[PDB]
Write a protein that binds this DNA or RNA. Structure first.
Ligand SMILES: Nc1ncnc2c1ncn2[C@H]1CC[C@@H](COP(=O)(O)OP(=O)(O)OP(=O)(O)O)O1
Ligand SMILES: [Ca+2]
Length: 625
DNA sequence: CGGCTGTCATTC
DNA sequence: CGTTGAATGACAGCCGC
């Protein structure tokens, strides 16, 4: 029927409690809430290291101590020294978000997050939930959970459907279920040779990602609203530039209103459709296909961009600057990492614009460091290529790379016209796009499309590239055959993705899976290296500079009852590592970043790292030896 | 009426 | 039928009790 424990009886109860507690290695933790949403209103923590029994830590209802208990919890929760114990929670980053932000305890020890293990098993799985896990993992204990009906986030976040059961009940049941279960999961991971890869790599990723997600990132509405009115100007100005040719009752917003003049005065449609086809016109016809490019691009650049940023921005009182907070995601099929409150990964790239007298805009320039700071970006110069170079061992690429400076510049140099350089970056980026598209098996006719040429000509070009490098086709078809013999691919860490569709009869699921093996291995391992560089950098950053960790921890200083120095984790562009750093340590910071990104693990080629630096989000790069 | 599958914008 | 991969958000249809 019942077993739980309030840990308050005068003293002795609580005392033998911490006395046991301090000794234990593996243990589990969960909290709960009630109302009011940040929030500091949290009922109390709960802990269990095993068995049907569980311990609760309040904040019946007896008394002696007050601030005391919180101190004990602190002392218990961190790694004095040399004493290495681990701790588990359903999801992670937000529980640590609370412990730091709500009550001001910076938890530091070894960490184990089970939904991440569950994911590490099945990258294609959908977003594990409690009920799903205790179902798939802890059966004989399960039925009890069914008194509640919530599974998305933890039992604190499930506060509503739990509200009829809410209290210590939720924190405790989450604690114990999580403990037996995570014991089972860890059994499963060690049952493969993934455990070193789990505890000693990806949980640290969740960690680094977390103190980031606390860092947030800097923003200035003055810039946002500046380029805002810029864009409004080009909006209406292009409206009249358009209706100078005709105009007939027009507004761009409606595609059916567009059907009128488009289908009428021009007549070339190879609902109807819109975009690709009119780009096909943007090459050739001058009379306002590209007016539609600039207009449509503008609208996307405002409504799906300026609005949400100007919405869900917040401020740090501790800075005097406003910043915005993403969320750690992971759960990518490859193992790459994304962010959603907005996603600032896809934020628009700078582009030029017409009103000599030209102009240019950057939606992204509005991200600033703190007043004293500057932003450091460390980009991998063509990492995945190097990876494929390692696995195919194509010596030819190893040489074309170990020499070539942005080998895209060479590909461009021999392609649309011969120029040695003075290659515009719009072109450079188009080239990068076409090529990376090819490597994973771009379609022949579509290649003919992006370059603008005929089918068989483009196909003879692809065949030409198999001829140029066969180590690729070797590695390629071979790894396909392995995916049939096994049914999964494997990234270098030993993390592996299950491709079900590779064996399927339907030609499409089979084709898609063939390429999918390729991209999954290379992008997956790419993201792996990146994670490793992140945790390296941050772990060094941690003790090496004796100041402290990240922006949440200030707020932690106010609850635990100054100058600004360090550099802080901000973002990952998957090969790019994004830091803001005080303009002090920026050189030290830079050489550390270069160092740990190049020092992840050694392989067939050296990984050059271009490192850009400067005020705001648009920038310059140089450093010397 | 909510899961499910797809076009259509942007990234890397 | 659907032949670059990984993403995020909208939006629109389709089932199917
Ligand atoms: N269109 C695409 N399709 C597939 N994979 C792609 C891709 N674009 C990028 N990747 C993968 C493979 C590369 C990786 C990051 O590519 P960057 O855009 O950062 O360009 P990088 O190659 O690093 O050259 P740099 O510009 O840095 O000099 O993401
Ligand atoms: Ca790059």
């Amino acid at each position: 029927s019942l077993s739980i424990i309030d840990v308050a009886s005068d003293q002795n109860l609580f005392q033998t409690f911490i006395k046991e507690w301090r000794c234990k290695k593996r243990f589990s933790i969960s909290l709960a809430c009630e109302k009011i949403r940040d929030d500091t209103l949290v009922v109390g923590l709960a802990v269990c290291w095993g068995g049907r029994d569980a311990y609760y830590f309040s904040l019946l209802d007896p008394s002696l101590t007050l601030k005391d208990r919180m101190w004990y919890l602190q002392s218990c929760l961190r790694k004095e020294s040399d004493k290495e114990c681990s701790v588990v929670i359903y999801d992670f980053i937000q529980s640590y978000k609370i412990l730091l932000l709500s009550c001001g305890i910076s938890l530091e020890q070894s960490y184990e997050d089970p939904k991440v293990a569950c994911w590490l098993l099945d990258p294609d799985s959908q977003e594990p939930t409690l009920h799903s896990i205790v179902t798939s993992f802890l059966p004989h204990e399960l039925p009890l959970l069914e008194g509640m009906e919530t599974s998305q986030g933890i039992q604190s976040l499930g506060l509503n459907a739990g509200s009829e059961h809410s209290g210590r009940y939720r924190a405790s049941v989450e604690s114990i279920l999580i403990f037996n279960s995570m014991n089972q999961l860890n059994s499963l991971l060690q049952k493969e040779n993934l455990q070193d890869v789990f505890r000693k790599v990806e949980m640290p990723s969740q960690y680094c990602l977390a103190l980031l997600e606390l860092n947030g990132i800097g923003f200035s509405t003055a810039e946002c609203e500046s380029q805002k009115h810029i864009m409004q100007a080009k909006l209406d100005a292009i409206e009249t530039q358009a209706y100078q040719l005709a105009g007939h009752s027009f507004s761009f917003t409606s595609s059916d209103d567009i059907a009128e003049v488009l289908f009428l005065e021009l007549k070339l449609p190879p609902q109807f459709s819109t975009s690709k086809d009119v780009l096909n016109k943007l090459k050739a016809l001058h009379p306002l296909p590209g007016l539609i490019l600039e207009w449509r691009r503008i609208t996307n650049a405002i409504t799906k961009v300026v609005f949400p940023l100007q919405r869900e921005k917040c401020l740090n009182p501790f800075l005097g600057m406003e910043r915005i907070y993403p969320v750690s995601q992971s759960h990518t099929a490859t193992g790459r990492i994304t962010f959603t409150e907005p996603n600032i990964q896809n934020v628009p790239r700078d582009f030029e614009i017409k009103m000599g007298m030209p102009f240019s805009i950057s939606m992204r320039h509005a991200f600033v460091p703190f007043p004293g700071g500057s932003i450091l970006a460390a980009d991998y110069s063509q990492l995945e290529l190097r990876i494929l170079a390692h696995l195919s061992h194509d010596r030819r690429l190893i040489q074309v790379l170990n020499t070539g400076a942005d080998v895209f510049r060479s590909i461009a140099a021999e392609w649309k016209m011969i120029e040695p350089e003075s290659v515009g970056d719009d072109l450079r980026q188009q080239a990068k796009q076409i090529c990376y598209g090819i490597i994973y098996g771009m379609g022949a006719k579509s290649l003919g499309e992006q370059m603008g040429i005929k089918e068989n000509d483009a196909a003879c070009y692809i065949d030409s590239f198999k001829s140029r490098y066969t180590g690729i086709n070797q590695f390629m078809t071979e790894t396909v055959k392995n995916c049939k013999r096994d049914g999964f691919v494997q990234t270098i860490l030993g993390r592996r993705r299950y491709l079900p569709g590779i064996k399927d009869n339907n030609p499409y699921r089979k084709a898609h899976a063939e390429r999918q093996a390729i991209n999954t291995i290379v992008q997956g391992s790419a993201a792996d290296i990146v994670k490793i560089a992140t945790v390296n950098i941050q772990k060094q950053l941690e003790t090496f500079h004796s100041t402290f960790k990240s922006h949440g921890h200030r707020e932690g200083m106010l609850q635990s009852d100054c100058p600004i120095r360090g550099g802080f984790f901000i973002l990952q562009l998957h090969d790019e590592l994004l830091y803001e750093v005080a303009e002090e340590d920026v050189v030290q910071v830079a050489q550390i970043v270069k160092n740990e990104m190049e020092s992840a693990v050694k392989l067939s080629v050296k990984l050059k790292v271009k490192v850009k630096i400067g005020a705001s989000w648009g920038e310059l790069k140089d450093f010397d030896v």
